[PDB]
Amino acid sequence: RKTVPEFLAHLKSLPISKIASNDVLTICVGNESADMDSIASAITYSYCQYIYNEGTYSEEKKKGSFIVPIIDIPREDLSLRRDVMYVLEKLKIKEEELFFIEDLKSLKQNVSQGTELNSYLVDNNDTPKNLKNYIDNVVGIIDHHFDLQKHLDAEPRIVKVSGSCSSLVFNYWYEKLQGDREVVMNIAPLLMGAILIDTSNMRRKVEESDKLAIERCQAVLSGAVNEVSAQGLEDSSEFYKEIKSRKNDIKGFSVSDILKKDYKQFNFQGKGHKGLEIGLSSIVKRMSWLFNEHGGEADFVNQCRRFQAERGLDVLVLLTSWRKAGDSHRELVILGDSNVVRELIERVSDKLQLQLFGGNLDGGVAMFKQLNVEATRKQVVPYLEEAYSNLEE
Ligand SMILES: [Mn+2]
After folding, report:
1. Are residues 91 and 156 in the same domain?
2. What CATH code is carried by the domain that includes residue 232?
3. Phi, psi of 318, rounded to the nearest 5 degrees
4. Can you say which residues are annotated as belonging to the binding site?
């Protein structure tokens, strides 16, 4: 019975032909932002599949093959997620045991050209754009984002409301593993990392899936007890503070690091035959902090324009958020051609309750207080998409 690092090291020790089966190599990948949820969900799916197939739950059912968990970023970018590093350290998962974009490319390169590369998707429901030329078929989906209604024949195909995708992944596998306590012990830090960050320690965005996953972890982590003490929840709170603090820590990172470490890119289809290439970076510190840490407004904006150019974007959006004295604050900063950016912002300003504090839409760089403090990137993207659909051409 291998632990999670032992399972990962075992995959690393195998020839690709023993990972693949009948000319199919199967992976599981999260989304291009590679946050805690994407990383935890991918590793969990893959590890649970391994345990399931090796065990007696799968008897008189038949056993597939290994699933390689993928983290969809360059290996070097892992360190930008200090919260994730901390949680991986708790499980003794070494970075050299994990599989990143480089590894997936080496896989695709080192396997025969006739071998199909099929993917489970977790924390997304269509293939990340950067992997479209690597992945042949989507075979299963577990996600909690807007349902794009693709891959309707996926097995499983779970796209449902959840604070954390990881809750859905875990509950799915927990049933199949008949509550296997060892598995739960072996993944709990990674699972709870994702659930607690995504739900702000089970205080925001909580759904029945998250409540169930937590209940299941508590039962195991407690073991045999005559009464339930406060200690488990106290430990959960200390762990939350550690991960939240580290997610909130971007000191010492470059502007490019900050922009790329929680980033999603889209192409919006509009009335024009050419779409809008748009990237959105979600950031944990306010603009004045960012400026002060990065040589000032001018220097900071210069580095943003560089990142925009490098990623081939028509529009770059920065979404900041933070909490102070118990209250949420948000800002939205947009960079792009004055025409498109003015029209987009003018169409979403009411819903997002945007108040200009710097720049000018006509210059193509503008900075807004966002008084709709409930709206995250998950909401902002469709608002912008709708706005873009209304633009003439
Ligand atoms: Mn998620």
Report:
1. yes
2. 3.90.1640.10
3. -110, 125
4. 37, 123, 144-145, 282, 377
Identify the domain containing residue 77 by its residue range: 1-248
How many angstroms is it from 393 CA to the middle of ligand 1?
A: 35
Is residue 105 located within the same domain as residue 14? yes
Q: Find the CATH number of the domain harbouring 383.
A: 3.10.310.20
Q: d(Cα 343, Cα 115) in Å, to the nearest integer?
A: 47
Known binding-site residues for Mg(2+) equal 37, 123, 144
Q: Which among 248, 264, 279 is the end of a domain?
A: 248
Asked if the peptide bond before residue 156 counts as cis, ω within 30 degrees of 0, the response is yes
Same domain flag for 200 and 306: no
Strands (E), 309-387: 315-324, 327-336, 354-360, 365-370
Q: Which residue type does 289 have?
A: W
- Resolution in A, one decimal? 1.8
- Kindly give the distance from the C-alpha atom of residue 177 to the centroid of ligand 1, in angstroms, as a whole number: 23
* CA of residue 38 to ligand 1 center, whole Å: 6
Tell me, in angstroms, the distance from the centre of ligand 1 to residue 167's CA: 10
- The three-state secondary structure class of 268 is strand
The total domain count for the chain is: 2
Regarding whether 161 and 104 lie in a shared domain, the answer is yes
Query: Distance from the CA of 289 to the center of ligand 1, in angstroms?
Result: 27
Last residue of a domain, one of 197, 215, 248: 248
Distance CA 157, CA 335 (A): 37
Cα(144) to centroid of ligand 1, in Å?
Answer: 6
Is the domain of 232 the same as that of 307? no
CA 37 – ligand 1 centroid, Å: 5
Distance between Cα 50 and ligand 1 center (Å): 23
Instruction: Please tell me the distance between residue 96's alpha carbon and the centre of ligand 1 in angstroms.
Output: 24
Amino acid at 353: Q
